[PDB]
A paper describes a structure:
The reaction center (RC) and light-harvesting complex 1 ([name]) form a RC–[name] core supercomplex that is vital for the primary reactions of photosynthesis in purple phototrophic bacteria. [name] collects photons directly from sunlight or from the peripheral antenna, light-harvesting complex 2 (LH2), and transfers excitation energy to the RC. In contrast, some Rhodobacter species, such as Rba. sphaeroides, possess dimeric RC–[name] core structures, representing the largest photosynthetic complex in anoxygenic phototrophs.
Genetic deletion of the [name] gene had no notable effect on the oligomerization states of the RC–[name] complexes, suggesting that [name], which is not involved in monomer–monomer interactions, is not essential for dimerization of RC–[name]. The Type-1 dimer (3.08-Å resolution) contains 13–14 [name] subunits in each monomer (the last pair exhibits poor densities).
Numbering used by the authors:
A (entry chain c), G (entry chain C): 5 to 69
B (entry chain L): 1 to 281
C (entry chain M): 2 to 306
D (entry chain H): 1 to 260
E (entry chain 9), K (entry chain A), M (entry chain D): 1 to 54
F (entry chain 0), J (entry chain 8), L (entry chain B): 6 to 49
H (entry chain 7), I (entry chain 6): 1 to 46
Write the structure that this text describes.
């Protein structure tokens, strides 16, 4: 790195940003998983919208009461 | 461009945010980060008032009015055409005033002077926020704030005052009015005294502060001094605005009746409440 | 940070008797006591006060005006000290009824005393104006205070003397009393339509708000540059220093234009004078030329209909 | 005369309001004209006159006759500042800061600026000197509040750089103006009172640190102070707020600097 | 049109770019609010009527 | 040869060229948005 | 700083965290302002709740139609 | 588009990044307010 | 409570911080679902 | 080659590249959120 | 008309161009708002009526 | 020959020529817009 | 009429030209607004009536 304008910050704040970064690695991975799951559910919901399920429509398989 | 003496003061530094990103001038105006923000907000607010003029149907500047949402909307949003433009203009005005105060801080600070001026502007900002934000939120609806019109916010003043009868009987109101009148009196006296000292009888020598003290001690018998008069001016103005904000924050919130009914308590005090004669009884 | 709002340590010594040009010191009294309470804010010295011919005239007339109103208040309470204590703000010395018109034939008890007190007040106020002029003249100063006071007197005269004569009735002057004169104000507004739609009323309010604005601005500026000796203004006019420059540059960088140590006081005096000047004009036009200001505003592009 | 019109809706209300608009325009012009007596004509950043002078022309000059035989000041007039300014422009275009070339406080530029006033003390009404130490004044004594004489003086870095010897008071005005603060160099410096926080045990100076107390411009004569040197002292003490910001032990400043 | 570039020997780029950014954002907000104000082109209300949300 | 900002001819041309590239990119995005809106709902 | 376990990351990611940090300084300040404003409004709303405004209640000052 | 990078030989990164963070947060708060204002897309309902 | 710091002589900070970030995000998403499930405190109704 | 800031060509390219990586990450998160909202409830 | 160019020996280009830009934008906004105010030439409403948007 | 702003004759002519080129470009775009509006809906 | 040019030895060109520009623009706006106010010569409404756009 030739920028040499960020290197002037004190070592304590370097540590600070290091661990802010550790936590955003961890839970950015977790967020990617959760929101990819929602996008998958959304794809299936759209496919369900475009199909004529919504006109001829099945009875309940199980009682639930 | 520059005053004869301005250049030795145009130095870097003394700014809260943004280093020297906006640490430059445009003509005489110092810009800064908060100058950029305040120009944005002021421009947007004036534009939205013009768009209100278009929607309402008048181009008469004295008839343009931007009304707040009606009472049924409560503290929620309203359509732009019937109350939302008022909300956006209010946000723009609040942002512009606050950015103006912070820009003043930056300038006071580049020049090495105290922060009395952004202090005193904050009092006016808080009075405006009392009228527009604190009281209507405490009181349930945006419809209790005033419209943005030259002659239609006077209608708001009149209606709000007469909801409680003669508003003259609000006591914090009386204190604020006395402060305002005293402030105008002090301003006239101060300007006159300094001008008369600097511009004496015509062709004779310029006067001294001793002459000012002598004149005013001859007049009434107690001169306050230059530092005293400037302190008294700042404090009179700030007290007036503070008591205005108080008299309006308590109105319709802890007092709901005629204000002479408030004054009624002194009359009913135990050791004269029953005597016949006089105005009362 | 020290804010310069209150002195943090005080000093005192010999009293200052004041300058001595063209002033008859036989009339100047002796210096009074020093007040430690007043010293935390400004000067602590009281006196000496000048007592001249106009001083005695004004003192006599004002004392008799105040005494006349007080004696009427005592009569109006039935001579009961407790009733006087409890109804001090409700008593009123009310002018003659409309049917007397401008005549001085009103009996003592519906407005003869009002006329007597008004005569005393007239003499007191005009004597005080003359005294302001002469106190300025004795020290070789300008007469700016006299003319600002003349603006205030113009509003006072319109309220109590000129407008009643134009309307042909003493019943339309202001009663002497706290709540009574407040009700006079409210009822004047009610009778003539909104005074809010009187354009000169609006101008008067604009200049009162401008007085509060300008004088907060100026007090704050002078207290902010008092670290460079900014409060010593006559000398900054005489010999410009860095306080004057920093104040000018603050206001120039803030709003694009500034003033001088001298010129801000021209702004101040005119801002304060215009209040009562436009107020007197508005009250004089009120009822004499327009008797329903809201309709006038409708006719002049001010009100929606 | 209620309600007759000369033409249209024009009556005495309208005549009065339009007359006032004209009078207000004239008065605004006059007020600005009076306020164009210091600092004009306008100039480029390189000292040459600008193409701008403004919609408002300069007024005719007027003369103040100074008291005590000091002469006459006539304004507007030719204004130079009779001192060199140690600044170098940052950009070629206009409206940009001029950075100090050497030490900023001490060449006297920026918040540390000063003005070449008359190197004479300002006088009271009777001709004597206006500002004066307590010992030189007859009858004056500290009258209320915490007497600062004899207290140590602490700078902005939480060192004590000297301690208070005397108070300079303003005779007619009856108020303290300077702290004579003496160092263990042995020479004395002047401290504006509005820059010092007098506490119970200690006189705090937020503006300066110990190492900058020695640099304060000293006084020519030891019982009097002239206007020039008052600017000089006040400008340095005040410019200490920005130019001694690094050396300062402020919790909030260190807070923000560590974050920044 | 070819030598319009000489405008940059007249104007300092920094100030011009700050002003231009402020102007462009303000203009975009202007136009979006104007569209939102009219019952048509208020895309939010249009979608609300299309899908019967209110 | 006229100079106020102190930039030279080559600097001016370089800065103006990169500006204009940005300007035409902005314009292209605006045209795409305008066509999308026009197709979605015309105003003429 | 004695930790010496964060210093092993490459300079490019040090730059990365430096500017992530710059942006969270800026808009953490902005978030503090916005949410303090909401808390002020909430305080005034609570004071309005506890007072008997909600029983005796003022008419509209301005027409708005 | 390729050489937009030289914007950073014009602007100091620190100041630009502070301004950009402030701008982005303010814009997000703005839009969440426009959505909150309309009866639909006001999610804070119920 | 004073010497809880010695936990870091037991656990490597990197691993702990990754795990803690994952845990906190998952817990927040969980609670959002709990609020979303009840007819009140469900903001996605509108 | 103006260098008001003081940066060179390589420094400029490095800073701009890391900026743009951050910008596209922000944009990707925004697109995911926008698609989620659009699927949940369209505005067109 | 040939020597109008000497106006630039009277006026500084920077100030004139700033003032001209401000003036032109304000005039354009003026005229657009005037057109939007009238029931005709309010192009938005015109297109709303033409396509039966309401 | 006044020299209020400092420019010479050749500088004045060059600046005025580039100004007028910009002015006529602006005018041409305005005329095209005006003709488009007039054809779309006349005001005379 | 021949020596009217000596007015420029009385008045500074810069101030006069600024004042003249302001005056001319204000007068033009005056007259256009006066024309727009009257039901006739309000060219907008007139074109609306002639082409029957209402
Ligand atoms: C040609 C074509 C025709 C055109 C026609 C149209 C003209 C358009 C003009 C546009 C306006 C231009 C600018 C005007 C403001 C100029 C101010 C100025 O120049 O200051 C210089 C000058 C500075 O003095 P200085 O240099 O500091 O003194 C140094 C000396 O060593 C020491 O000197 P000194 O200590 O001896 O001070 C002496 C001097 C200096 O005064 C001061 O020190 C400043 C004080 C400011 C407060 C003054 C206001 C006091 C109000 C008095 C009563 C008010 C009620 C009047 C009734 C209301 C009207 C119906 O005192 C005065 O001048 C004030 C006298 C007030 C008497 C008012 C009598 C009733 C009105 C009669 C009109 C004529 C008035 C006098 C005119 C000649 C003056 C020489 O101050 C003045 O002269 C004050 C000017 C007063 C103007 C008139 C005041 C009232 C105005 C009424 C407005 C009504 C509008 C219409 C509405 C209703 C209509 C139906
Ligand atoms: C319902 C009531 C009406 C109304 C009715 C009136 C009437 C009626 C009048 C005013 C007037 C004024 N009103 Mg209004 N007013 C209303 C609403 C407002 C509002 C508001 C926000 O609602 C405001 C800010 C104002 C403000 C003002 C002032 C601008 C103005 C008075 C100037 C002044 O200082 O007089 C105070 C100063 C004086 C009276 C001068 C006194 C001078 C003399 C010399 C003093 C002598 C002192 C004596 C000797 C005592 C000595 C004491 C000892 C020495 C201790 N009004 C509504 C619409 N108002 C006046 C005016 O000018 O209107 C155009 C006026 O007459
Ligand atoms: C003791 C307290 C007093 C006091 C104090 C001080 N006051 C100050 C200062 C101090 C100390 C300053 O330092 C500051 C300043 O620099 O002055 C030159 C300021 C200022 N005092 C203004 C007006 C003013 N002071 C009033 C009152 C008092 N002030 C009280 C009494 C009143 C009324 C009605 O009473 C008014 C109108 C402006 C001139 C100026 C702000 C400009 C601004 O913020 O620009 C930024 C805003 C704009 C340029 C325009 C914004 C337009 C919005 C978006 C659309 C708004 C429409 C509107 C909501 C409705 C219309 C109906
Ligand atoms: C510009 C417009 C402002 C202004 C102006 C000015 N006002 C001045 C001066 C100027 C310039 C003076 O030079 C003069 C003076 O000397 O000041 C120290 C004066 C005064 N303004 C007084 C009162 C007052 N001003 C008010 C308003 C404004 N004034 C407006 C805002 C109000 C109200 C109701 O608002 C009130 C009550 C007295 C203190 C005093 C006259 C004493 C008198 O006449 O005594 C004569 C009367 C007595 C001696 C009776 C005493 C009764 C017994 C003894 C107790
Ligand atoms: C005494 C009366 C004052 C009270 C106020 C009266 C009301 C009129 C407003 C004037 C306020 C005081 C300023 C007077 C002088 C100002 C000045 O000198 O400008 C020069 C300065 C020029 O700076 P400069 O003066 O330093 O330039 C130096 C060169 N000379 C001196 C030669 C000019 O102008 C400015 O930079 C700032 C502008 C001041 C005016 C701002 C007022 C804003 C009001 C907005 C109202 C819009 C109407 C809205 C209506 C409804 C919608 C359409
Ligand atoms: C109701 C109105 C009451 C009267 C108001 C009088 C002032 C009106 C506003 C004038 C502000 C600017 C004046 C100086 C100036 O423009 O100089 C620029 C330029 C450059 O001037 P300059 O700044 O280089 O100064 C020349 C030298 N001195 C200072 C000595 C005079 O002027 C010109 O070259 C030609 C001027 C053309 C006419 C004015 C242009 C528009 C000015 C109005 C503001 C912007 C347009 C707004 C349109 C929308 C409606 C508001
Ligand atoms: C109410 O009125 C309504 C709203 C109805 C109608 C309103 C009408 C108004 C009049 C509309 C006004 C429109 C204006 C006039 C449009 C102007 C558009 C142009 C001028 C804006 C310019 C855009 C170009 C921008 C995007 C530039 C981008 C370039 C950056 C990406 C980097 C380039 C910056 C420098 C040169 C790069 C680095 C320099 C090097 C060489 C060191
Ligand atoms: C009222 O009008 C409304 C609101 C209705 C419509 C108006 C809308 C307005 C007009 C829209 C305006 C939009 C503006 C123009 C959008 C601008 C967006 C900006 C450009 C987004 C830029 C984002 C830049 C990103 C955040 C840059 C990030 C740089 C990084 C922080 C540097 C290091 C990169 C790291 C941290 C990320 C990847 C590496 C690791 C270690 C994860
Ligand atoms: C209510 O009233 C209504 C609205 C109904 C009617 C209103 C009527 C009013 C009176 C309309 C007023 C119209 C005004 C008078 C029209 C003025 C038009 C002209 C004066 C505007 C000028 C436009 C020219 C601009 C676009 C210049 C563009 C040139 C730039 C692209 C670069 C050129 C700048 C310099 C010279 C280039 C670099 C120089 C180098 C060589 C150093
Ligand atoms: C409501 O009341 C109504 C309206 C019904 C009735 C109103 C009646 C009122 C009273 C009417 C009042 C009318 C006034 C009194 C008329 C005055 C007319 C005269 C005095 C005006 C003068 C006009 C002359 C102007 C046009 C001068 C033009 C000369 C310039 C072209 C250049 C000459 C200037 C200098 C000398 C040239 C250069 C000099 C060199 C040698 C240095
Ligand atoms: C125990 O305490 C004692 C009894 C010893 C004394 C205490 C007295 C207290 C109670 C005094 C109370 C005084 C009241 C409260 C003062 C209130 C004054 C009110 C507020 C004045 C307000 C407005 C009055 C102004 C407008 C009057 C203006 C009238 C002037 C224009 C002069 C009028 C000119 C007259 C009519 C000319 C008549 C000429 C002769 C021939 C009659
Ligand atoms: Fe003053």
């Amino acid at each position: 790195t030739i920028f040499n304008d960020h290197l002037n910050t004190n070592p304590k704040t370097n540590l600070r940003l290091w661990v802010a970064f550790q936590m955003m690695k961890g839970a950015g991975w977790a967020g990617g998983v959760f929101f990819g799951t929602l996008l998958l559910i959304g794809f299936f919901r759209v496919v369900g919208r475009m199909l004529p399920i919504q006109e001829n429509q099945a009875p309940a398989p199980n009682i639930t009461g | 461009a520059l005053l004869s003496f301005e250049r030795k003061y145009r130095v870097p530094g003394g700014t809260l945010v943004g280093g020297n990103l906006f640490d430059f001038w445009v003509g005489p105006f110092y810009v800064g980060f908060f100058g950029v923000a305040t120009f944005f907000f002021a421009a947007l607010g004036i534009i939205l008032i013009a768009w209100s003029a278009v929607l309402q149907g008048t181009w008469n500047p004295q008839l343009i009015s931007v009304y707040p949402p009606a009472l049924e909307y409560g503290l929620g949003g309203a359509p732009l055409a019937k109350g939302g433009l008022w909300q956006i203009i209010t946000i723009c005005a609040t942002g512009a005033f606050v950015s103006w105060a912070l820009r003043e801080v930056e300038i006071c600070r580049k020049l090495g002077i105290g922060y009395h001026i952004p202090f005193a502007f904050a009092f006016a900002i808080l009075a405006y926020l009392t009228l527009v934000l604190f009281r209507p939120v405490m009181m349930g609806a945006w419809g209790y704030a005033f419209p943005y019109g030259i002659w239609t916010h006077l209608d708001w003043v009149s209606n709000t005052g007469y909801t409680y009868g003669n508003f003259h009987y609000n006591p914090a109101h009386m204190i604020a009015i006395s402060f305002f009148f005293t402030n105008a009196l002090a301003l006239a006296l101060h300007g006159a005294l300094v001008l008369s000292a600097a511009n004496p009888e015509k062709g004779k020598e310029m006067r001294t502060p001793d002459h000012e003290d002598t004149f005013f001690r001859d007049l009434v018998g107690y001169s306050i001094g230059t530092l005293g008069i400037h302190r008294l001016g700042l404090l009179l103005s700030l007290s007036a605005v503070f008591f205005s904000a108080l008299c309006m924050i308590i109105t319709g919130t802890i007092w709901f009746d005629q204000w002479v009914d408030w004054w009624q308590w002194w009359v009913k005090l135990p050791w004269w409440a029953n005597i016949p004669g006089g105005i009362n009884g | 940070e020290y804010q310069n709002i209150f002195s943090q340590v005080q000093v005192r010594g010999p009293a200052d008797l004041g300058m001595t040009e063209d002033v008859n010191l036989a009339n100047r009294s002796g210096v009074g006591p020093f007040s430690t309470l007043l010293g935390w804010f400004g000067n602590a010295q009281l006196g000496p006060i000048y007592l001249g011919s106009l001083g005695v005239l004004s003192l006599f007339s004002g004392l008799m005006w105040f005494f006349t109103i007080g004696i009427w208040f005592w009569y109006q309470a039935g001579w009961n000290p407790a009733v006087f204590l409890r109804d001090l703000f409700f008593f009123s010395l009310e002018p003659p009824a409309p049917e007397y018109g401008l005549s001085f034939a009103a009996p003592l008890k519906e407005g003869g005393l009002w006329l007597i007190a008004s005569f005393f007040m007239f003499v007191a106020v005009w004597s005080w104006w003359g005294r302001t002029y002469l106190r300025a003249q004795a020290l070789g100063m300008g007469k700016h205070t006299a003319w600002a006071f003349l603006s205030a007197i113009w509003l006072w005269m319109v309220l109590g003397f000129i407008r009643p004569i134009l309307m042909g009735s003493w019943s339309e002057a202001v009663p002497y009393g706290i709540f009574s004169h407040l009700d006079w104000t409210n009822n004047f507004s009610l009778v003539h339509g909104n005074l809010f739609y009187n354009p000169f009323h609006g101008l008067s309010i604009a200049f009162l708000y401008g007085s509060a604005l300008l004088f907060a601005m100026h007090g704050a500026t002078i207290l902010a540059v008092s670290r460079f000796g900014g409060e010593r203004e006559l000398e900054q006019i005489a010999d410009r220093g860095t306080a004057a420059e920093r104040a000018a540059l603050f206001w120039r960088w803030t709003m694009g234009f500034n003033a001088t140590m001298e010129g801000i006081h021209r702004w101040a005096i005119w801002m304060a004078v215009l209040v009562t000047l436009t107020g007197g004009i508005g009250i004089l036009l009120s009822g004499t030329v327009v008797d329903n200001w809201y309709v006038w505003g409708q006719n002049h592009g001010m009100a929606p209909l | 005369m209620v309600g007759v019109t000369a033409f249209g809706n024009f009556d005495l209300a309208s005549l009065a309001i339009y007359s006032f608009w004209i009078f207000l325009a004239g008065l605004i012009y006059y007020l600005q004209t009076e306020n164009m007596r210091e600092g004009y004509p306008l100039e480029n950043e390189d000292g040459t006159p600008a193409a701008n002078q403004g919609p408002f022309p300069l007024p005719k000059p007027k003369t103040f006759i100074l008291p005590h035989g000091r002469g006459t000041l006539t304004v507007p007039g030719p204004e130079s500042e009779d001192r060199p300014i140690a600044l170098a422009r940052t950009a070629v275009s206009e409206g940009f800061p001029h950075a100090p070339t050497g030490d900023p406080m001490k060449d006297g530029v920026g918040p540390a600026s000063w003005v070449a006033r008359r190197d004479l003390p300002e006088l009271d009404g009777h001709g004597h000197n206006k500002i004066k130490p307590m010992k030189a004044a007859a009858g004056f004594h500290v009258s209320a509040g915490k007497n600062p004489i004899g207290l140590p003086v602490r700078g902005c870095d939480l060192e004590i750089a000297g301690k208070v010897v005397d108070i300079w008071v303003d005779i007619p005005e009856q108020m303290a103006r300077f702290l004579e603060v003496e160092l263990k160099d042995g020479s004395t410096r002047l401290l504006p009172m509005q820059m010092v926080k007098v506490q119970s045990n200690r006189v705090h100076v937020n503006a300066l640190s110990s190492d900058l107390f020695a640099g304060i411009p000293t006084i020519k004569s030891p019982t009097e102070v002239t206007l020039l040197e008052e600017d000089k002292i006040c400008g340095y003490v005040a410019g200490g707020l920005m130019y001694a910001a690094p050396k300062r032990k402020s919790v909030v400043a260190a807070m923000l600097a560590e974050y920044a | 049109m070819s030598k319009f570039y000489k405008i940059w020997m007249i104007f300092d780029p920094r100030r011009v770019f700050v002003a231009q950014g402020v102007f462009l954002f303000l203009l975009a907000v202007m136009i979006h609010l104007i569209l939102l104000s009219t019952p048509s082109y208020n895309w939010l209300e249009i979608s609300a009527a299309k899908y019967n949300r209110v | 040869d006229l100079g106020y900002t102190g930039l030279t001819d080559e600097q001016a041309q370089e800065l103006h060229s990169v500006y204009m590239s940005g300007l035409w990119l902005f314009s292209a995005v605006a045209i795409v948005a305008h066509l999308a809106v026009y197709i979605w709902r015309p105003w003429f």
